[PDB]
Amino acid sequence: PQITLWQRPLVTIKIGGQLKEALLDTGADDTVLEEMNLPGRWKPKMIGGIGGFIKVRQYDQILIEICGHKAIGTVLVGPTPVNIIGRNLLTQIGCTLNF
Amino acid sequence: PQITLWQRPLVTIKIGGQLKEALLDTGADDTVLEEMNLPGRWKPKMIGGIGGFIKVRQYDQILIEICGHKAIGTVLVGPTPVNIIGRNLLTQIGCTLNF
Numbered sequence: 248p249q250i251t252l253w254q255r256p257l258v259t260i261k262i263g264g265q266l267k268e269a270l271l272d273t274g275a276d277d278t279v280l281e282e283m284n285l286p287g288r289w290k291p292k293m294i295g296g297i298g299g300f301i302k303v304r305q306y307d308q309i310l311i312e313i314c315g316h317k318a319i320g321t322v323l324v325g326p327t328p329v330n331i332i333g334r335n336l337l338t339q340i341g342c343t344l345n346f
Numbered sequence: 347p348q349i350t351l352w353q354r355p356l357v358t359i360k361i362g363g364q365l366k367e368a369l370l371d372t373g374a375d376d377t378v379l380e381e382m383n384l385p386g387r388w389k390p391k392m393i394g395g396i397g398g399f400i401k402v403r404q405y406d407q408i409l410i411e412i413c414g415h416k417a418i419g420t421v422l423v424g425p426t427p428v429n430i431i432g433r434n435l436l437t438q439i440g441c442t443l444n445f
């Protein structure tokens with residue numbers, strides 16, 4: 248699809264057998280999901296943004312279905328206010344900006 | 347232009363007679379610029395994101411030239427780590443997401 252930006256670019260995703268809504272975020276290097284039940288091992292990590300840093304859990308090779316496109320990659324889980332699909336997954340679904 | 351997301355979508359902007367680089371950020375409702383010398387009055391404001399909240403100064407009707415497209419709107423100035431062009435200005439230059 249083509250998506251204009253008058254509203255937040257939210258899409259439905261399926262991850263870990265669960266359905267969530269997430270923001271397509273060209274300003275996010277990484278994908279960061281609200282606290283949720285993901286299976287497997289992980290590695291602690293810190294990420295920064297506006298207002299400071301948060302500790303997250305880093306899961307690799309996680310399958311996400313993003314508005315019907317499948318992608319595999321790193322997903323961070325932690326105290327984010329909104330589910331964020333970052334560039335590590337946006338490139339996998341062929342997402343571009345256009346103006 | 348069409349912009350892929352393998353790298354940060356940075357563009358050159360001109361604001362207040364100054365040249366800066368800024369991130370085209372579909373995940374940002376607002377435009378937030380690193381501390382910089384803007385003229386005029388303002389109103390204090392708080393914004394939130396990953397890692398918490400920051401206080402910014404809100405300037406309205408600011409002219410920004412974003413990769414050669416002119417836009418006028420609200421610009422926030424404060425302790426952001428990166429210059430962010432948010433959706434309030436992205437809609438004005440006709441920016442879309444495509445996948």
Ligand SMILES: COc1ccc(CN2C[C@H](O)[C@@](Cc3ccc(F)cc3)(c3ccc(S(C)(=O)=O)cc3)C2=O)cc1
Binds near residue numbers: 273377432
């Ligand atoms: C490294 O991997 C990451 C890092 C951060 C995030 C969370 N992100 C993505 C938002 O693009 C961003 C922009 C931003 C990103 C990095 C950074 F160092 C500084 C800023 C943002 C900007 C403005 C607004 S606002 C107040 O206008 O709504 C909201 C969000 C943010 O904080 C995810 C992954």
